[PDB]
Amino acid sequence: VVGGTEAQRNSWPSQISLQYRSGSSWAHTCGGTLIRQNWVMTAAHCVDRELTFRVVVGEHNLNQNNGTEQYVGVQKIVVHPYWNTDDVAAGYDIALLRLAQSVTLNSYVQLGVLPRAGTILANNSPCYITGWGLTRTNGQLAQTLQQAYLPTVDYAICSSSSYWGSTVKNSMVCAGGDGVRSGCQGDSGGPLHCLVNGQYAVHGVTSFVSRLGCNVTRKPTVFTRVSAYISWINNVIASN
């Protein structure tokens, strides 16, 4: 997250860190949202690589013991069947991870609330992106979980020529684009939390930013629109 502020450690208890094994250690690669005690929602592109993955719930500082983490292996990966790694702009950038164990819920570990199917946010709706992604374009991961206020940009604006044009689809949510605050590499897969009827819900799965840079004016961060995939999500969980 570029232009973030450090999150309070119990603000976003559905945020997870998706990590891969690298030598004698683990490396953060993406975010995700805990949606069942044994299921995480992330981006398809995050699991394109044949890697060994684990999820960390209850995480705040990637580099320090927080006293709240739970570590769990990824047992099954279900990518959306229409995802094409060649074509992030086509959409379908969503995947579900069944965890090897069920995690225990507490003020640091909670399920993310998903929107009702079909919900579209009005332009300029209040949302926060969260994650441990780069804090500058071509920078380094954050140590502590960051949040940034990113107001939505509706489809009509976001798919205009000055913004993303043809690249954005109605199966996506755009947020931000102010040139200061954005998602960045390592935020992919995590949530976009939007306040609706007094309740935050996870409306987006972080998908992509401009090839120019993370925080680019009129290139809002682009998210998979969770509310387009409610039936898909439920179908996967019920058949696994």
Known binding-site residues for Ca(2+) equal 59, 61, 64, 69
Catalytic residue among 14, 28, 80, 93: 93
- Closer residue to Ca ion in complex, CB, 19/159: 19
Tokens representing 164?
């993303």
Concerning whether 171 is annotated as a catalytic residue, the answer is no
Residue 139: partners with Cβ closer than 8 Å, 6 or more residues away: 2, 184
Q: Report whether 14 contacts 191 (CB < 8 A).
A: yes
Provide the H-helix boundaries in the chain.
Answer: 155-158, 230-239
Among 53-61, 94-102, 159-167, 168-176, the segment contacting Ca ion (CB under 5 A): 53-61
The residue nearest Ca ion at its CB is 66
Residue 132 CB, nearest approach to Ca ion (Å):
10
Residue 61 CB, nearest approach to Ca ion (Å):
5
Residue 8 CB, nearest approach to Ca ion (Å):
15
In order of 23, 57, 99, 172, the CA distances from 121 in angstroms are 43, 28, 31, 11
**Burial, 50: exposed, middle or buried (Cβ in 10 Å; 0-12, 13-18, 19+)?**
exposed
Tokens representing 171?
């199966």
Concerning whether 193 is annotated as a catalytic residue, the answer is no
217 binds Ca ion (CB under 5 A): no
144 binds Ca ion (CB under 5 A): no
Concerning whether 182 is annotated as a catalytic residue, the answer is no
- Pick the binder of Ca ion from 10, 61, 119, 137 (CB under 5 A): 61
- Closer residue to Ca ion in complex, CB, 66/123: 66
- Closer residue to Ca ion in complex, CB, 66/171: 66
> How far, in Å, CA of 162 to CA of 4, rounded?
25
- Closer residue to Ca ion in complex, CB, 66/185: 66
66 binds Ca ion (CB under 5 A): yes
The residue count for binding Ca ion (CB under 5 A) is 2
Nearest to 122 by CA among 182, 173, 177, 164: 173
- Output the furthest CA–CA distance in the chain (Å, rounded): 48
Q: Which residues are catalytic?
A: 45, 93, 188
Per CB under 5 A, residues contacting Ca ion are: 61, 66
